[PDB]
Design a protein around this ligand. Structure first.
Ligand SMILES: CCC(CC)(c1ccc(OCC(=O)O)c(C)c1)c1ccc(OC[C@H](O)C(C)(C)C)c(C)c1
Length: 250
């Protein structure tokens, strides 16, 4: 069966497309406002050296901080999100933040050279930049695997925005109070996505692959949390971050 999208489902898709267009600048025009990228010599990927310098950390922390603000804005526009309590909205945003950033970064991600191309050479980010921010291969290798696997799904913009909305509105996040309300909002989003794929995605299993990406994001979130904890032990690290990053990941 291929039921047509209801008027309400068509409205949800329009709302989410508009939300993404207002909160994701595909020209990356604000990036020059961040603390500048610094790329030192570290061909060997020396952990001691990367931790002693964290050369790319101020630029990447400003980029993540900016992205969290945009994600907060996108989330406020998800139909139903405003019906949740303030406490539940914050629990969902804090727990999903890194996962939504990983999803949204797929738009700048290119398989041409396995980089995140956000403008000129200064804003072209690679694995080596993430290591220069104090992260290890345990996060980097599954991160690139996730980006390639997601890129290969060739998602329509409608599917990409619904995936980010489903990611945020997850009833199984620790500390949630009204899990039933969150689940109701997510089911409305999931049904819209499932109906959209069946009635709009041409051939050549897509929904199950998308659900799998959400599970992959949980593993990446856990690995990122462990790595952030290690990074927080580096003296003077806090100054290289932002108050928003400190609160979200602390
Ligand atoms: C450079 C790679 C990456 C991938 C998600 C990134 C690339 C572009 C981004 O945007 C352009 C786009 O969304 O199109 C964002 C928003 C992040 C990233 C950036 C920083 C980072 O580490 C951050 C570090 O963990 C702190 C939280 C300590 C700052 C990690 C693991 C990954």
């Amino acid at each position: 069966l291929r039921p047509k999208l209801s008027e309400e489902q068509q409205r949800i898709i329009a709302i989410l497309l508009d939300a993404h267009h207002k909160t994701y600048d595909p020209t990356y025009s604000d990036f020059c406002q961040f603390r500048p990228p610094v790329r030192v010599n570290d061909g060997g990927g020396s952990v001691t050296l990367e931790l002693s310098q964290l050369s790319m950390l101020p630029h990447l922390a400003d980029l993540v901080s900016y992205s969290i603000q945009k994600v907060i804005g996108f989330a406020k526009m998800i139909p139903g999100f405003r019906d949740l309590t303030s406490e539940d909205q914050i629990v969902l945003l804090k727990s999903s933040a890194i996962e939504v950033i990983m999803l949204r970064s797929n738009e700048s991600f290119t398989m041409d050279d396995m980089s995140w191309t956000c403008g000129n050479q200064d804003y072209k980010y690679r694995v080596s930049d993430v290591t220069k921010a104090g992260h290890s291969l345990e996060l980097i290798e599954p991160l690139i695997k996730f980006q390639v696997g997601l890129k290969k799904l060739n998602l329509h913009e409608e599917e990409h925005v619904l995936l980010m909305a489903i990611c945020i509105v997850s009833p199984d996040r620790p500390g949630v109070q009204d899990a039933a309300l969150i689940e109701a909002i997510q089911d409305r989003l999931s049904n819209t996505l499932q109906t959209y794929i069946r009635c709009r995605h041409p051939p050549p299993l897509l929904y199950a692959k998308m659900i799998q990406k959400l599970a992959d994001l949980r593993s990446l979130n856990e690995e990122h949390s462990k790595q952030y904890r290690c990074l927080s032990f580096q003296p003077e690290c806090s100054m290289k971050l932002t108050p928003l990053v400190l609160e979200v990941f602390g």
